Structure formats: structure tokens, C-alpha cells
Design a protein around this motif. Structure first.
Motif, mmCIF file in Angstrom:
data_model
loop_
_atom_site.group_PDB
_atom_site.id
_atom_site.type_symbol
_atom_site.label_atom_id
_atom_site.label_comp_id
_atom_site.label_asym_id
_atom_site.label_seq_id
_atom_site.Cartn_x
_atom_site.Cartn_y
_atom_site.Cartn_z
ATOM 1 N N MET A 89 -1.855 -3.660 13.012
ATOM 2 C CA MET A 89 -1.494 -2.000 14.083
ATOM 3 C C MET A 89 -1.990 -2.438 15.253
ATOM 4 N N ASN A 90 -1.978 -3.838 16.512
ATOM 5 C CA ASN A 90 -2.578 -4.104 17.691
ATOM 6 C C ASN A 90 -0.701 -4.191 17.418
ATOM 7 N N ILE A 99 0.335 6.460 18.669
ATOM 8 C CA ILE A 99 0.887 6.313 17.498
ATOM 9 C C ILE A 99 -0.644 6.593 16.182
ATOM 10 N N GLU A 100 -0.155 7.140 15.384
ATOM 11 C CA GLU A 100 -1.542 7.086 14.165
ATOM 12 C C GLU A 100 -1.434 6.873 12.558
ATOM 13 N N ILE A 128 10.328 -4.739 13.961
ATOM 14 C CA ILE A 128 8.909 -4.230 13.764
ATOM 15 C C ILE A 128 8.542 -5.070 12.140
ATOM 16 N N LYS A 129 10.020 -4.936 11.900
ATOM 17 C CA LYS A 129 10.470 -5.672 10.350
ATOM 18 C C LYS A 129 10.136 -7.385 10.046
ATOM 19 N N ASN A 130 11.204 -8.269 11.818
ATOM 20 C CA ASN A 130 10.544 -9.241 11.784
ATOM 21 C C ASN A 130 9.649 -9.399 12.452
ATOM 22 N N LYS A 131 9.494 -8.538 12.847
ATOM 23 C CA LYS A 131 7.392 -9.031 14.134
ATOM 24 C C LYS A 131 6.929 -9.212 13.401
ATOM 25 N N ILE A 132 5.999 -8.744 12.393
ATOM 26 C CA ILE A 132 5.446 -8.300 11.294
ATOM 27 C C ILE A 132 5.540 -9.284 9.657
ATOM 28 N N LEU A 133 6.116 -9.582 10.261
ATOM 29 C CA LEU A 133 7.004 -11.226 9.256
ATOM 30 C C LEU A 133 6.724 -12.202 9.655
#
Ligand code: CA
Ligand code: CA
Length: 341
Positions: A89-90, A99-100, A128-133
Motif C-alpha cells: 500500500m505504501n 487512495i482507498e 504498478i505491476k512491475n513495481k510490486i513484482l
DNA sequence: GGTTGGATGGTAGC
DNA sequence: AACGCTACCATCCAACC
């Protein structure tokens, strides 16, 4: 406006695999063990290799072990998933101030001042996908639309490891042609009641009189569906304010013995108070779940706020009241705080 | 007529 | 049917402004 919804895939199961990569490819079933017997409980969530065969959140563990005896059955570690979720979430806040946090694995980002059109939204979605991966080795699904609801449907269609836009003209199309049971918030119970009224698509909610729909599924879900159907839904992205907090635990054995139950109720109140974290409730309900999974609530609202210590005193009073007014054995016991200042 | 309150019944979804 | 758990909503009746 544009909305971006991130859903972490089979989340509890994914974290268990980050923590033990030897689970890759195996059916993983995260479980809530009650302590009654060996293997007594309910599935909290399972990964796609287990769902393949019927093993889904909700069903009993014994159902699951009949379907997949050699699957890896892990106990639930909510504290661990919570930490992981919070670190994800950060990362999400780096892309939008608005954000919610809808849940432990779901967030909506208003990205109206971050991107102009749906092309860019897709590109930020891959970012966002690549970042969290990159940081947490967690796959997610991204859905982009004009509102929270159709952004969540977009993620549902593209599930595992996906990404999917729904432009304005496909919203129009989906109001017409989407199975109404796939609308967020509409479970199988509500889908069957709607099907009995002859509502199979969102657009069908505008043929039936409003009071006949409200009389069947409540005013809340009534207004919600009619709103989506008009294409008028536009709820803002905002911090979800929690209206009540609490815990209820399963007892080792069923009981009607005040002193045998006391410890569990007290344990639930403790855990509830840590969850409250500076919030002051004015109301307490003791919830006893009976031998036959029915529920017996006794409660009190106070003129003033409730301290941990007052909660103990007051919960014994309320439990004593359940034992007087109802003579079934209790199986689960706990507590529910509400009416925060 | 609206609201707070408490008991009973019920629902979505990880 | 088996069966866990958090939090939310719905309906009724009572008491109240
Ligand atoms: Ca989810
Ligand atoms: Ca009453």
C-alpha cells in the motif's frame, strides 16, 4: 474521471510462497483452524492450483482434504499478510495521494490528476505491476475504468497476473450484457433472489418498480444497482471509516459455564482493544455463537466511553444475560465494539 | 416522521 | 452437511424528541 484498482492475487497463498518458494506449482490452501479437532476449520483462501478442483474460501477443511489430500495446508498468519499488504500500500501511495484501502488485498487509486486518457492508465498500471513484482515478488491484477465498480470488474475478468481497461462504451455494453452476479457486492444469495425477480443484467433493475427491488435485497443494494444501471455511480475514493471492531473465538469445547467461558471472552476483548488503537467505543455487544451456529447478542450503549477494564466488567454482565435468557450451549464467544467517538 | 437502542435475522468475501 | 471469522446490512418494536 479515471480509477485504478489493484487486487493482489490469491494473496495469503502468495505470501506463503514468497516465504517458502518450494510451494511454486503446488496446491496451497490457507486455513483457519478452530482448535476443536485435528484439521477442523475453514479455508480462508487458496491458490489457483487448488481452486481448480473446488477448494475455495468458505468450505470446510474436511471438504478440502477429501478433494486434495496431498495439498499443502497452512495455518493463517494474518499478522504477516497485514505487514506485507501495508508495504504494498505504501508503494501504491507513490502513484497517487487519493487512495482507498478496501481490504487487506484491495486498493483503489484515483488517478485523474496523474493521467489524461486510458492509454496512460494502462501504462501506469504496468508500472504498478512491475513495481510490486520488483519489491515484494507479488503478482497483482490491475483494473481501470471510470468508477470504482467497473474498475473492480475489470480486474475480475483479467484475474491472475492480469491488466484490463473498460472504456466508456464497454461500460454501456456491460450494463446491458454482464451477468449481474459478477457485480461487486452481489453474492450467490443475492444473485438467486435477483434471478427470481427476473433480473439477470444490470439494466433489468430499471424495469422493476423500486419498492419491489428494495423489498427483496434492501435499500442499500437496491440504490447501488439502479445507480450502476443508469451509469450515474460516482462514489469518491476515500479512507474507509470502520464502524465497529471486535473478535470472536472458538472455544475448545461447548459450554454454559461462566468461569470456563470467562477466559475466552477476556482474550477476545484484549485482542479487540489492541485493534481499536486509540479509538474510544461507547458500545459493547457480547456475541455468543451457539451449539448450532445460531447467534445470541447482548449489548449496552454507554453515556460515556468504554475502557478495557470496564469492558471486562460489562461483558461478564452481558454474558450472564445470554446464559439466563437462552439455554443452548455456547460454542464461540466474543465481543464487538462500536459507536466510536 | 426521524433517531437512538437493542434483539433477531441475515449477507459478502478473504 | 461437514464449517472460521470480520464487518456489514435489514427488520421489528420500544421509547423518545
Ligand atoms: Ca480480492
Ligand atoms: Ca425490544
Amino acid at each position: 474521471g479515471i480509477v485504478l484498482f489493484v487486487d493482489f492475487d490469491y494473496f495469503y497463498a502468495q505470501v506463503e510462497e514468497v516465504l517458502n518458494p518450494s510451494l511454486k506449482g503446488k496446491p496451497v490452501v490457507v486455513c483457519v483452524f478452530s482448535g476443536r479437532f485435528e484439521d477442523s476449520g475453514a479455508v480462508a483462501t487458496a491458490n489457483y492450483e487448488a481452486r481448480k478442483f473446488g477448494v475455495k474460501a468458505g468450505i470446510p477443511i474436511v471438504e478440502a482434504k477429501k478433494i486434495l489430500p496431498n495439498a499443502v495446508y497452512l495455518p493463517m498468519r494474518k499478522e504477516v499478510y497485514q505487514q506485507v499488504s501495508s508495504r504494498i500500500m505504501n508503494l501504491l501511495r507513490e502513484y497517487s495521494e487519493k487512495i482507498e484501502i478496501a481490504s487487506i488485498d484491495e486498493a483503489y487509486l484515483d488517478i485523474s490528476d496523474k493521467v489524461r486518457d486510458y492509454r496512460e492508465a494502462y501504462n501506469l498500471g504496468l508500472e504498478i505491476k512491475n513495481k510490486i513484482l520488483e519489491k515484494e515478488k507479488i503478482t497483482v491484477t490491475v483494473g481501470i475504468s471510470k468508477n470504482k465498480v467497473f474498475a473492480k470488474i475489470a480486474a475480475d475478468m483479467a484475474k491472475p497476473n492480469g491488466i484490463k481497461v473498460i472504456d466508456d462504451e464497454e461500460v454501456k455494453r456491460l450494463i446491458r450484457e454482464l451477468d449481474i452476479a459478477d457485480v461487486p457486492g452481489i453474492g450467490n444469495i443475492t444473485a438467486e433472489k435477483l434471478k427470481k425477480l427476473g433480473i439477470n443484467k444490470l439494466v433489468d433493475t430499471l424495469s422493476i418498480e423500486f419498492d419491489k427491488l428494495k423489498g427483496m435485497i434492501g435499500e442499500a443494494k437496491a440504490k447501488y444497482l439502479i445507480s450502476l444501471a443508469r451509469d450515474e455511480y460516482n462514489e469518491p475514493i476515500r479512507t474507509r471509516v470502520r464502524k465497529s471492531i471486535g473478535r470472536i473465538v472458538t472455544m475448545k469445547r461447548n459450554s454454559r459455564n461462566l468461569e470456563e467461558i470467562k477466559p475466552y471472552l477476556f482474550r477476545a476483548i484484549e485482542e479487540s482493544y489492541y485493534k481499536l488503537d486509540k479509538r474510544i467505543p461507547k458500545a459493547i455487544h457480547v456475541v455468543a455463537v451457539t451449539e448450532d451456529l445460531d447467534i445470541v447478542s447482548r449489548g449496552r450503549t454507554f453515556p460515556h466511553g468504554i475502557s478495557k477494564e470496564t469492558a471486562y466488567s460489562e461483558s461478564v454482565k452481558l454474558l450472564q444475560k445470554i446464559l439466563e435468557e437462552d439455554e443452548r450451549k455456547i460454542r464461540r464467544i466474543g465481543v464487538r465494539f462500536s459507536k466510536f467517538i
